[PDB]
Write an enzyme that holds these catalytic residues in place. Structure first.
Site, mmCIF file in Angstrom:
data_model
loop_
_atom_site.group_PDB
_atom_site.id
_atom_site.type_symbol
_atom_site.label_atom_id
_atom_site.label_comp_id
_atom_site.label_asym_id
_atom_site.label_seq_id
_atom_site.Cartn_x
_atom_site.Cartn_y
_atom_site.Cartn_z
ATOM 1 N N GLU A 16 41.897 41.320 0.969
ATOM 2 C CA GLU A 16 42.737 41.517 -0.209
ATOM 3 C C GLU A 16 43.123 40.149 -0.776
ATOM 4 O O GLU A 16 43.294 39.188 -0.024
ATOM 5 C CB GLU A 16 43.979 42.339 0.160
ATOM 6 C CG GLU A 16 44.889 42.739 -1.001
ATOM 7 C CD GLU A 16 44.158 43.551 -2.058
ATOM 8 O OE1 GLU A 16 43.988 44.774 -1.862
ATOM 9 O OE2 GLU A 16 43.772 42.972 -3.094
ATOM 10 N N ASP A 21 41.466 45.758 3.360
ATOM 11 C CA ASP A 21 42.412 44.656 3.236
ATOM 12 C C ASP A 21 42.224 43.534 4.241
ATOM 13 O O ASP A 21 42.388 42.361 3.909
ATOM 14 C CB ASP A 21 43.829 45.207 3.321
ATOM 15 C CG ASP A 21 44.150 46.105 2.152
ATOM 16 O OD1 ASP A 21 43.777 45.729 1.016
ATOM 17 O OD2 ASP A 21 44.753 47.178 2.365
ATOM 18 N N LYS A 54 44.738 57.792 1.364
ATOM 19 C CA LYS A 54 43.845 56.836 2.029
ATOM 20 C C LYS A 54 42.755 57.470 2.872
ATOM 21 O O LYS A 54 41.590 57.141 2.681
ATOM 22 C CB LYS A 54 44.639 55.856 2.900
ATOM 23 C CG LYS A 54 45.633 55.003 2.146
ATOM 24 C CD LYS A 54 44.857 54.107 1.186
ATOM 25 C CE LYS A 54 45.753 53.148 0.424
ATOM 26 N NZ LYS A 54 44.969 52.306 -0.519
HETATM 27 O O1 LIG Z 1 46.274 49.780 -0.881
HETATM 28 C C1 LIG Z 1 46.037 49.099 -1.893
HETATM 29 N N1 LIG Z 1 46.724 49.417 -3.082
HETATM 30 C C2 LIG Z 1 46.567 48.738 -4.315
HETATM 31 C C3 LIG Z 1 47.427 49.282 -5.432
HETATM 32 C C4 LIG Z 1 48.561 48.610 -5.911
HETATM 33 C C5 LIG Z 1 49.386 49.106 -6.932
HETATM 34 C C6 LIG Z 1 49.148 50.331 -7.568
HETATM 35 C C7 LIG Z 1 50.027 50.863 -8.628
HETATM 36 N N2 LIG Z 1 51.388 50.768 -8.798
HETATM 37 N N3 LIG Z 1 51.714 51.452 -9.924
HETATM 38 N N4 LIG Z 1 50.670 51.990 -10.478
HETATM 39 N N5 LIG Z 1 49.588 51.666 -9.708
HETATM 40 C C8 LIG Z 1 48.030 51.019 -7.091
HETATM 41 C C9 LIG Z 1 47.208 50.515 -6.070
HETATM 42 C C10 LIG Z 1 45.665 47.676 -4.367
HETATM 43 C C11 LIG Z 1 45.380 46.840 -5.591
HETATM 44 C C12 LIG Z 1 45.361 45.431 -5.530
HETATM 45 C C13 LIG Z 1 45.104 44.599 -6.617
HETATM 46 C C14 LIG Z 1 44.847 45.159 -7.868
HETATM 47 F F1 LIG Z 1 44.603 44.385 -8.908
HETATM 48 C C15 LIG Z 1 44.854 46.548 -7.998
HETATM 49 C C16 LIG Z 1 45.112 47.352 -6.882
HETATM 50 C C17 LIG Z 1 44.970 47.350 -3.166
HETATM 51 C C18 LIG Z 1 45.118 48.004 -1.978
HETATM 52 O O2 LIG Z 1 44.445 47.677 -0.846
HETATM 53 MN MN LIG Z 2 45.554 48.477 0.832
HETATM 54 MN MN LIG Z 3 42.801 46.304 -0.836
HETATM 55 MN MN LIG Z 4 41.827 45.133 -4.316
#
Ligand SMILES: O=c1[nH]c(-c2ccc(-c3nnn[nH]3)cc2)c(-c2ccc(F)cc2)cc1O
Ligand SMILES: [Mn+2]
Ligand SMILES: [Mn+2]
Ligand SMILES: [Mn+2]
Length: 200
Positions: free
Chosen positions: A85, A113, A139
């Site tokens: 990540e 991640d 997940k």
């Molecule tokens: O579990 C996770 N999760 C997420 C994640 C984080 C926030 C939201 C979110 N919050 N509000 N609306 N969407 C959704 C997924 C992300 C993620 C990271 C960077 C990016 F540019 C986009 C998504 C990554 C992950 O591993």
């Molecule tokens: Mn994650």
């Molecule tokens: Mn991720």
């Molecule tokens: Mn990502």
């Protein structure tokens, strides 16, 4: 109290390295951190948890897993975790491909991640404003087939992890939970929490 901006909170309460990596990721996926601000804060939070998850964990001279909280210890120590990540798509997959070919572990269908060199498995980290069991299934159902380990944190202190295997010691996970609690409280004092919580 007065309502603060989520932007201000993110820039004030996360270190600039986290914030910058988060901005770059959003830009990469075509979203603007100055509009999708709750997502912005969520991405920073999750990134930080990923770093805190790997913080202080090394593999020793004899090849077992140890914890050192200084910067002065032994350079023969290997980091226990690879952090996937925070990298752009090309570099993230480059790192995953390298791990998979070296260790011989199976290639994941989606970017995880972390990779854990002790347990020899990828980790999907989750941070949710909802109940951990529900988010866990979300997940578990995306990753389809699984060798990838899932570990979910909530902002209220709950955890859920694959097969009740939590990977880290209680102290490490306590640091993470304390940070999440602190983020939640600080958002709350700026009246950002309710909006943030409901946006997931
Ligand atoms: O579990 C996770 N999760 C997420 C994640 C984080 C926030 C939201 C979110 N919050 N509000 N609306 N969407 C959704 C997924 C992300 C993620 C990271 C960077 C990016 F540019 C986009 C998504 C990554 C992950 O591993
Ligand atoms: Mn994650
Ligand atoms: Mn991720
Ligand atoms: Mn990502």
């Amino acid at each position: 109290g007065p309502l603060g901006s989520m932007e201000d909170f993110v820039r004030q309460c996360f270190n600039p390295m986290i914030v910058e990596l988060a901005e770059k990721a959003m830009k990469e996926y075509g979203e603007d951190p100055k509009i999708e601000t709750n997502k912005f804060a969520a991405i920073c939070t999750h990134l930080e948890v990923c770093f805190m998850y790997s913080d202080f964990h090394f593999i020793d001279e004899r090849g077992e897993s140890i914890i050192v909280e200084s910067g002065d210890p032994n350079a023969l120590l290997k980091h226990r975790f690879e952090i996937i990540e925070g990298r752009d798509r090309i570099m993230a997959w480059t790192v995953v491909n390298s791990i998979c070919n070296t260790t011989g572990v199976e290639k994941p269908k989606f970017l995880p991640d972390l990779y854990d060199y002790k347990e020899n498995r990828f980790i999907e980290i989750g941070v949710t404003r909802r109940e951990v069991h529900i988010y866990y299934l979300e997940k578990a159902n995306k990753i389809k087939s699984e060798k990838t380990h899932i570990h979910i944190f909530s902002f209220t202190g709950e955890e859920m992890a694959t097969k009740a295997d939590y990977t880290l010691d209680e102290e490490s996970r306590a640091r993470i939970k304390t940070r999440l609690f602190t983020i939640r409280q600080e958002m709350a004092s700026r009246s950002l929490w309710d909006s943030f919580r409901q946006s997931e």
